[PDB]
Each structure stands twice: as structure tokens, then as C-alpha cells.
Symmetry: D2
Subunit: 236 residues, 4 copies
């Protein structure tokens, strides 16, 4: 089995230092260029996904699209899941990152930001930045949909989708591409490689460079993962 991970480029909210989470912000101008770059790289390195999986967030879907266009594999079957979404950013959604750094303190900031299991505070249902009741989730059990998340919770909800849905395709011989987010992709990597809960806070997946994993029959790295641009990704 062959799997390809792609982290979308920057979000418009990202360019203005705002916490996005499940807010459906779109890609930035350079975000869009990285998508082309990612697709460009996909073609260059001869990696052809047979299927596409994306979250329900437009910034990821755009990336997948601009990338497949450039890769010449737009015809590919596509499935989307709330499960591959970014980490819900609780009450922190839509708030300035420099400003949240001074509201709380570095300690509590890195907790609400990088605590493996401490999610930001729950966002109020009436806040303009909560998507509780959003059209794209009307068919999902209302109760599973979070109002805040941590990488811990994210992994919980991501794994089933990988176990049943994504895995069936991998096990069928198809090459899959997953256009997703930072925390959602980070969670799959932690799981995919066997990284401790204390170490996961140090791994960051760069945006715009396809990360490939050649998996064995048990869906585990048969060889080490690789970026299609080891040089750019190496930078950090």
C-alpha cells in the first residue's frame, strides 16, 4: 500500500495571525501556489493517487483540487469526512495568537496550543465562530461533533475513518492521497509511526510537500516516510 499526505498551505486567517480551527476560512494566495507546487511535485516524483480523501474544510479541499489539476488526475474519486478536519480550537477560534499569548501566559498558551490532552476552553454555542449546526455536519450525530479539541480527542475521531474507510482502499491496492490539516495529519503520523504522547508535540508537518508512506500488509511503514522535496521540508 502507498499513501500520500498533503498539508494545505496557509489560511487567510493564518496570514493575519488568527486561530482557525473548524472555521471555514479559505486558502491564501501563496497557500494556492503551494497547492500547485504540491501537485507539481506529485507529478514530478511519479506518485499517482487512485483515490482522494479530504476533510470538510474548504482550505484543504482547494489544495487537493489545485494539486490534482496540476498532477493531471482530477478524475479521481473523492470522499470527505469531518473526521479528517483540523483540531477544533474551542473559544480560541478567531482570536489573535499574539494577543492570546498575553491573555494567558506562555505556560497556559503552550497548553491550550500543544497540550496533547488539554483542549482550549469550549466555545460558546452563540459565538460567531462556532459551527455548531453547520450545514456540512447535518447528517453527523450532533453529539460527537466537538466544541473544542486536543490532539488526543482528534486522534480518537480520526482513527475509525482510517480503520474502516481509508484502510479498505489501501488494502485494496489503491494509492491514497489525504489532503488535510496540521493536527489531523499530525495525529495520523503519531499513530502511523508509533511516536510517544510526550514526543508528538515536537513533530510538525510542513505545508505543501507531499509526505509519502510505503506501508506493508499491516498498514505500517515498510520503509521510512519521505517528502517529495526532502530539501524544502528539511528546512523546518
Amino acid at each position: 500500500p502507498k499513501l500520500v499526505l498533503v498539508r494545505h498551505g496557509q489560511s487567510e486567517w493564518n496570514e493575519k495571525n488568527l486561530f482557525t480551527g473548524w472555521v471555514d476560512v479559505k486558502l491564501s494566495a501563496k497557500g494556492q501556489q503551494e497547492a500547485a507546487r504540491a501537485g507539481e511535485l506529485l507529478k514530478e516524483k511519479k506518485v499517482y493517487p487512485d483515490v482522494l480523501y479530504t476533510s470538510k474544510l474548504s482550505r484543504a479541499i482547494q489544495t487537493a483540487n489545485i494539486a490534482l489539476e496540476k498532477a493531471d488526475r482530477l478524475w479521481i474519486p473523492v470522499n470527505r469526512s469531518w473526521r479528517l478536519n483540523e483540531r477544533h480550537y474551542g473559544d480560541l477560534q478567531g482570536k489573535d495568537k499574539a494577543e492570546t499569548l498575553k491573555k494567558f501566559g506562555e505556560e497556559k498558551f503552550n497548553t491550550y496550543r500543544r497540550s496533547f490532552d488539554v483542549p482550549p476552553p469550549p466555545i460558546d454555542a452563540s459565538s460567531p465562530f462556532s459551527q455548531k449546526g453547520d450545514e456540512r455536519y447535518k447528517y453527523v450525530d450532533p453529539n460527537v461533533l466537538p466544541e473544542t479539541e486536543s490532539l488526543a480527542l482528534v486522534i480518537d475521531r480520526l482513527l475509525p475513518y482510517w480503520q474502516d474507510v481509508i484502510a479498505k482502499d489501501l488494502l485494496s491496492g489503491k494509492t491514497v492521497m489525504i489532503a488535510a490539516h496540521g493536527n489531523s495529519l499530525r495525529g495520523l503520523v503519531k499513530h502511523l509511526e508509533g511516536i510517544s504522547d510526550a514526543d508528538i508535540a515536537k513533530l510538525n508537518i510542513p505545508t505543501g510537500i507531499p509526505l509519502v508512506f510505503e506501508l506493508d500488509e499491516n498498514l505500517k511503514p515498510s520503509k521510512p516516510s519521505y517528502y517529495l522535496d526532502p530539501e524544502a521540508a528539511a528546512a523546518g
Copy 2:
């Protein structure tokens, strides 16, 4: 939303005093009759399933196969999932019950059976009662398949199927019928009714009597769940 649960009747293993779990034991002539009764109740009380969900275990499949024939709704779409399978009994699978009750004194016997948090001994891959590597689960991530299960674990691997899949048909106005097993059905009832970890071990759903649940937009019981033959069930 309307959900109808149906627990299969007796298998030829329960009939012979054997723990079953995930072994694909056939339904006994007595079970087959209870299913026809389940289908009869469905028809008599006007419970018209629009979609059918079952496990990967034949006794649950056969039950629906017979229940639906008598309900005259055998055309209904069928969907199956390991996630709806009976709790995996581990090492206890190919084991005479009366013998393990003696082998292990109450302390071990009663716990393995009704403990919510602690599972039975894992069954080895060598055992002729292990499912490790079974065909019907070759398209599922090998690392997720359990070798033993507590109700806790069952509720855990079942919830995401309920949340994404069954929830969609339910939220689409499709009356869904589910054919599963004791632990899986109780595990779902507990979530719907919010039964506590300490109280769930008390609950039991009669074999062969359809259970209807009227649900609201948030999939919560809008009124108490009822059996189609309240009288036959009440004798529990």
C-alpha cells in the same frame, strides 16, 4: 428518527453451553423461530424498516434474513459492519460455560461476563476459535481487530459507525433496523439512554423481540423504548 433493534435468538453453541463471541456459529432451529416471530411483530405493529444494518456474524444476518421475509421488506438495502459484532470473548470463545464457571471462581467468571472496564484473556492466533486473519475482515485495518473485549471496548469501536453511518440514514428519515448482538445492542442502548457504567451490567435485551426507539433531531429517545411484544419482554 425511528430505530428498531433486534437481538438474535439462540445459536447452536449457546444451545451446547459454549461461549461464542466472534466465532461465526450458526443460529439454532429455536433462534430461527424467534426471528420469524421478530418479523411477525414488525409487521403486526407496523414497524417498517427502510434500511437494514447487521454485523458480520451469520446469526445476526440470518435473523434479519428471516425477520425481513416475514415483514415483507426483504428488498430493503442491507449494510454490514464488524463494528456491530458481539463482544469478542477472547480465550473463552471455544469454552464450555459450566466448565469455566468451575475453573474460575465467581471472582473471575462473573467479571469477564459483566465487568464493564476489564476484558477476558486474549485468545491466541493458534486457537481454532480465533478470527485473526479472517476473510470477512481483510479490508479492515489488521491492528484494530480485538482479541478480547469488555463492553467498554465494544461501545468504543461501535460508536463511530453509529455516529457517521447509522446516524446519516436516521437523520435522513430512514427507519433503520439493526440486527446485532446482546453486548452491541446494550452498548448502544446505554449511549442512547445514558445508562451508567455501574447500571449497564444490569440491563439485558430479550432475544427475538424487536425494540423500537423514537429519537429526536439530536438522536435522543423522545419517549421510552418499547418492545413490540411488551408482555413477552416484561417476563425478563
Copy 3:
């Protein structure tokens, strides 16, 4: 690719000499026994379907079920289609076959019965034996659903399902089983083997004996088709 065809046993209406068509009549007692026999044979001859396709008619679905139970492959994924249904029997639906033989004459009878392209008359929408508006077809384009059919028309509607849906599985490596009817199966065979339109009237698929076809990459017989009980088939 490996494909398995199974014609359900007799219908309750069949035992009483009535034209069934799309009427949702169920299996007869012996019909049910042949299903077991078919599944029995499936196991015996080591043919294991990975997927199941059935029409929307209960007499076919039952057969598939009783058969898979006996074969020990109930866990199999299942899909159903109005396209694999029996030939709609027009105004002839629910009518006595001996009696229809005397209403019309042998000539017109064998026309309304075996004419490759002359369907029985259209059945009136109000007749107790029309399923126009039936629950199992509410999601299908109202206009495609027939009110009479001939093997000709049947093949038209059956082919797309075979082309897109059944073919994808065959092309994916799966072994497929199709629990269907006389005309629907006859149509797939005519197509599968390249039998003329004038010759198709002579081929009849026996009920209760799995017919297997070992297909090549182009979905055509790589070897000749075979029943899992060549003897009874003969």
C-alpha cells in the same frame, strides 16, 4: 473474473400457473429447497462469491439468502437493483397461463410470451397487479419504470447496471453472484455469449443450479459456462 448466476426456484404464483412478472410473490416450499440446494452446490464445488447482486423481488432475495446461509458466506456485501428484475408482464400479470392460452391463441401467446421484442399489453395503472408507485422504486426515475416488457426492453435496462456496477467488481477481482430471474438472467446470457436475437427464444436457464462463467479481462467467456450440477441441468 469469475461470475455465478442463480435462477430462483418456483414462485407461489408459479405453482398455481399465474404470470408473476414484477409482482412481489414469494418462493414456494420447493423453491426454498432449491435455494438450499443451490447454496449446497456453491459450497461443494468450491465457488465463493465475494459480493452479491439481487433484483428487488423477494423471491430472488430469499433464494440468495437461503443459498448463502448454506454456503457459509452470509457476511457478504449485497446490492439490489430494479434492473436485475424479472420481465414486467404487462396486463398479463396475475393471469392464468392456461386461460391466457385460450384468450389469445398459441401464435399471439408465444408472442406475448417469447417474442424477443413484442411485450404483452401495457397493464392499467389501477389494476391490483401493477406496482406503479411501489415503495421499493420511489427513488428511481418514475419514467424509466416499465408497465410491460419484452426480453429486448429488459436487456436495455439490465446492461447499464452490468456495465458500471457489476463490472467494477468483476474488474476488481471479486467473484460475483447474481440471484435473479428467468428473463433477466436470459438477457445477461444472450449478451454474455453472443446469441442471436432469433435464437434467444430457445435458451432456458434451469432454476436452482449455479451457472458459472470464467470471464477474461474483457468480460467474455475465457472457457465455456458451466452448471455446478451439469447432470440435473441436463
Copy 4:
């Protein structure tokens, strides 16, 4: 039931005077703009697709990919099918239009283009413009894939997809948007509106302007189909 059709704009082949058919030619910078306009109309007029259907041809895919981004409905489920592909132009695929107009006199040229019942010359498997054996169609019965197509044939292989698949979402209250091609869209309009074999050759749907169809329970137009920019379509 509500259906919204959207014909893709110009490809880099139309731009260079080449017949396209089933060749997977890219959408030109001009087509890309018409799609953003299609998405804008969708948003402006409040046409909210719930599901998206497209062909296996990138220009149709890209159109939806852009139209939906501007409509802010990029999360909508996507379904694709060869059955929604443009008519297969046969031997005329990798051919300069002005040249075939000269090569063949009106008798042949105009017919291949607008005849309803008679198709173009079959393209050979050797041609670098044949799709025989293409990856995106490896899961479809090899015997069904056309080497040439008349509108008649297109309407024929398209109808069953419409009847079983699109019909289900339509009958489930899902507003469905379809991104296809001139012949496929006209072929569907003719069925919906019952246009005759002789009249269909007259119809044409403007590239880039969404077309809405209000349908009844039997999927018949409950009122005339309208363009989201009636004025631009009227030109």
C-alpha cells in the same frame, strides 16, 4: 427537485481550433474565468447545490472545482461518471476544425457535428487521441466504451445514470449540480423538455452560465428552465 447544469467554458484545444470529444484537454484561462463567473451566479442568485455530479473530463471537473470555491460549497459530495462525458468525436478528435471543414464538404462536416442519428468515423486504438485502455475507465466494461458517438448514442449511455443515480438524490430533495459538456447537457435537456430529434440540433447551452431546472415528483420541468444571468445567455 432542483437541478443546476453548468457547461464548461473554453479549453486550450477549442482555443487552438481542435475537436476535443473525449480527449482530456485542459481548461483555458478564459474557461477558468467563466467558471468563477458560474460560481458567482450560483451564489448571487442563491442556487445552493447539495451534491455535485461531473464527468471524467478535467475541464468539467475544474469548472465545478472553481465554481464551487466561489459559491462557498466546496464541501458538497462529489460524484463522477463517464456517462456524463462529452460526445466522443471519433477520428475527428485530434483534428483542426478548419481543416476538416475543407477536407469534408458541408455534407460530411455539418452532419458529424449536428446529425442526431449518425456518428463520426471511429478513431483507431493506435491514434494518440484514442482513450481505449485509459486508466479512469478501467473499472467500466471494456465493451461499452464508444469510439465515436452521435448525440443519440450519448443520450443513450447517459440516460441510465440519470435514471438511477442522479434521480435518487433529486427525489431525496438534494439540489444537484451537474458539470458536463455541450452534447451531454443538451442531451439531458432534450429528455427533460422532450425536444424532438429534428429540433435538438438547434439547441445550444451557453458556456459558463448555470442553468436551473425546477422539477416535479416525476422529474418534469415545473416551469421553464432559466439561466442565472438570463441576459448574458440571451446574447
